[PDB]
Amino acid sequence: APVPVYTVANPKNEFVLVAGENNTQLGFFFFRKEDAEALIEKIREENPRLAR
Amino acid sequence: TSLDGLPETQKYVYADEWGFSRVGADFPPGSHPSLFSQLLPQALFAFDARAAVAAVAVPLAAMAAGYGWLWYMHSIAPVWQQALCAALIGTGYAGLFKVAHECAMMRFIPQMPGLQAALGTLLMAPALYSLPSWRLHHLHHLLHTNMLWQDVWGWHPLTKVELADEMVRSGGSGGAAMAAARLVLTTPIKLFASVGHWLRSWDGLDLRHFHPASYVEVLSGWAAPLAFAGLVLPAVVSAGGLSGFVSCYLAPWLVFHFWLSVLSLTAHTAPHIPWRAEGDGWDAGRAAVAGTVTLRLPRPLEVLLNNANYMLPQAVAPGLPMWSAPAAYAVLAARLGPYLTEASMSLKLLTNHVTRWQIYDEEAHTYRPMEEVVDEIEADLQQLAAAAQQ
Amino acid sequence: XXXXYXXXXXXXXXXXXXXXXXXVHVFRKXXXXXXX
Ligand SMILES: CC(C)CCC[C@@H](C)[C@H]1CC[C@H]2[C@@H]3CC=C4C[C@@H](OC(=O)CCC(=O)O)CC[C@]4(C)[C@H]3CC[C@]12C
Numbered sequence: 134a135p136v137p138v139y140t141v142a143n144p145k146n147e148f149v150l151v152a153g154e155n156n157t158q159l160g161f162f163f164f165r166k167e168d169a170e171a172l173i174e175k176i177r178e179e180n181p182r183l184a185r
Numbered sequence: 186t187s188l189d190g191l192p193e194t195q196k197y198v199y200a201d202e203w204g205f206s207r208v209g210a211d212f213p214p215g216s217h218p219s220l221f222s223q224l225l226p227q228a229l230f231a232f233d234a235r236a237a238v239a240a241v242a243v244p245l246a247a248m249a250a251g252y253g254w255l256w257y258m259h260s261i262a263p264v265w266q267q268a269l270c271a272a273l274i275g276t277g278y279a280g281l282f283k284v285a286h287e288c289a290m291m292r293f294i295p296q297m298p299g300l301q302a303a304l305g306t307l308l309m310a311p312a313l314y315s316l317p318s319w320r321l322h323h324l325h326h327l328l329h330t331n332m333l334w335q336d337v338w339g340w341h342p343l344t345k346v347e348l349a350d351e352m353v354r355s356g357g358s359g360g361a362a363m364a365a366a367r368l369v370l371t372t373p374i375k376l377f378a379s380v381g382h383w384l385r386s387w388d389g390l391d392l393r394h395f396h397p398a399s400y401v402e403v404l405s406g407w408a409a410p411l412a413f414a415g416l417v418l419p420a421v422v423s424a425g426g427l428s429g430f431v432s433c434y435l436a437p438w439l440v441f442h443f444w445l446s447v448l449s450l451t452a453h454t455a456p457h458i459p460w461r462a463e464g465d466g467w468d469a470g471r472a473a474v475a476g477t478v479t480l481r482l483p484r485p486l487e488v489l490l491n492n493a494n495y496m497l498p499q500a501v502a503p504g505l506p507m508w509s510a511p512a513a514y515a516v517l518a519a520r521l522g523p524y525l526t527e528a529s530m531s532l533k534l535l536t537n538h539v540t541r542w543q544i545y546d547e548e549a550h551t552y553r554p555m556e557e558v559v560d561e562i563e564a565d566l567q568q569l570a571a572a573a574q575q
Numbered sequence: 576x577x578x579x580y581x582x583x584x585x586x587x588x589x590x591x592x593x594x595x596x597x598x599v600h601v602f603r604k605x606x607x608x609x610x611x
Contacts, residue, residue: 148610153591153603160610171599176606181261183609 138162141169149176149183186211186475187457187550199457204534208457209475210523216470222502224520229509236508237294240491244280247273247489260428267432275440276489278311282441283491285309287507289320306406310413312441317399317406318386327500331453331472333462333547338382340450342460342545342552343370349562358559370543371555376535377439379446444490451480451534452496455526456542459550473500474524479514481529487511497525 140162142148150158163169177184188199189211196208251273258266287293288305295301305316326338333344343366355363369378387407388394395403422430458476461467480494487494495510498517505513518525528534542552544559579588587593592604 143609149606150608150610151601151606152608153605157591158608159589159591159601168595172606175599179605180607182258183606185259185261 138164139166139169141173143183186471187459203456204531204537205455205478205526205528207525207527209526212471212475212524214466214468214471216468218470218473218501219503220470220501221474221517221521225502225505225513225516229505229513232294232296232506233508240507241281241284244277244284244489244491247277247280251277255432259425260432267436271432271436272440274437275444276486278437278441279444279493280489280491281308282312282445283493283507285316286319286323289316290323290503292504292506306409310409311417312438313383313410313414315386315403315406315410317403318388322386327503330469330500331458331460331476332467333460335463340454342454343543345544345546345558345562348544348559352559352562352566358563367555371539373539375539376447376450377442379442379449382445383442444493447535448480448493450538451528451530452478454478454538454542454552456552457526460545460547473497474521475526478526478528481527 140148140160148160150160152158161169161172163172173184186209188196188208200206200208251270255267255270255274284293285305285308288301288308291298291301293301293304302316309316309319322338326336329335330339348366351360351362352358357363369375390407392400392403418434421434425433453476455478458478461472474497477497477500479497482490482494491507492510495514498510498513499505501517502513541554543555545552546558576590578590578593581587584594584596587595592602594600594602
């Protein structure tokens with residue numbers, strides 16, 4: 134418990150997944166908020182709805 | 186009228202020179218608009234619920250569509266998408282405001298007067314307007330149409346004489362009022378001068394202009410705008426911040442005021458329509474029939490505005506409902522044909538309104554550009570200074 | 576399981592094929608989905 138991780142989600146408490154080939158979807162957990170920040174600012178450049 | 190007896194050739198060259206389609210001949214004096222209410226079939230006055238619900242529901246649907254889109258893409262959209270949703274919302278609200286103007290003159294649903302009063306109040310509030318004061322100013326306008334020095338609730342023109350007086354008081358053309366007039370009636374901001382109208386309502390918030398027996402009714406009228414601007418304009422801001430304000434309220438507001446101002450300004454202003462003083466040849470029927478211009482729009486725009494351009498019919502038959510205004514016009518165009526004036530909304534018309542017809546001089550009884558007029562009257566200032574030699 | 580890493584840009588490998596180019600570039604061997 135004393136060590137946390139960071140994730141990016143919707144407002145409605147749902148993980149955002151990166152589906153690739155053959156509808157296989159990958160999640161993520163980052164030990165630093167800069168990583169989730171990079172993920173979201175990459176989401177914004179190809180979808181502004183989810184990133185907003 | 187200004188262009189009296191003269192062949193059709195000069196009429197039509199003036200017409201296509203100014204952008205009008207059919208110019209007008211000359212109406213006899215000594216009449217009244219309420220006369221021609223006998224030329225109308227009696228079926229035009231009938232009430233039907235179909236057109237009523239259609240007129241209250243189409244602009245509501247346009248507004249809802251614009252808002253659903255705009256919120257679905259709140260602030261991720263570029264400026265042109267914002268402009269287009271604002272234009273759509275402004276036009277939808279101009280339609281609902283025409284409905285409210287109908288309820289103010291008591292000719293939308295006369296069977297249920299309490300309901301139509303409540304409906305008019307509700308639809309007028311979001312524009313920060315009062316229903317009783319609106320009724321009063323519109324009646325005062327109908328009674329004084331095109332009367333010089335008296336029609337203060339319409340596009341009263343800036344005359345040459347008052348301009349000369351202000352220039353003699355200012356000691357030059359650089360004062361504050363000078364530059365104010367300069368930018369208000371020379372730039373496209375003129376197409377929004379209706380906002381000035383908005384500020385002249387609330388007659389100083391002064392209950393000393395009205396008849397005492399009506400105080401409670403007038404006060405109530407002022408409390409519906411305020412309540413809006415006191416309960417709803419906070420929420421909007423608090424829920425969207427400055428941007429969420431300027432895109433959800435201020436831009437539709439500016440579009441609505443564009444519609445209001447352009448409609449009225451085109452309605453009662455043209456180079457061949459004179460502004461006679463009182464006692465000096467002002468005639469009621471002559472000013473309400475010959476001194477009116479009918480604007481034609483595409484039928485989608487018309488059905489979105491609830492036929493808001495057809496103003497002549499409801500000045501001769503003030504009880505004529507809103508959905509019978511197109512048809513009725515077709516009747517009058519047959520009998521009053523040679524006297525009416527008509528125009529189509531095009532770029533040339535607005536360019537002429539902005540750049541050419543700016544000052545009204547009564548000696549020539551016509552409109553002339555502001556700059557040439559001011560430099561001419563300034564050259565006559567120099568010549569009277571030379572005449573002031575001794 | 577885990578994901579192999581190689582700090583060349585730091586390439587990676589999963590059991591798709593990430594490449595956290597220092598930014599991000601989640602290659603495939605396109606983040607339009609949401610959990611349920
Ligand atoms: C602040 C925003 C978000 C909400 C809308 C506010 C309006 C309801 C306010 C702001 C501007 C106000 C007007 C600004 C100017 C005047 C003139 C003022 O009276 C005078 O100036 C009288 C003549 C004189 O002082 O010489 C008070 C009424 C009125 C119409 C005000 C009425 C109330 C208005 C429309």
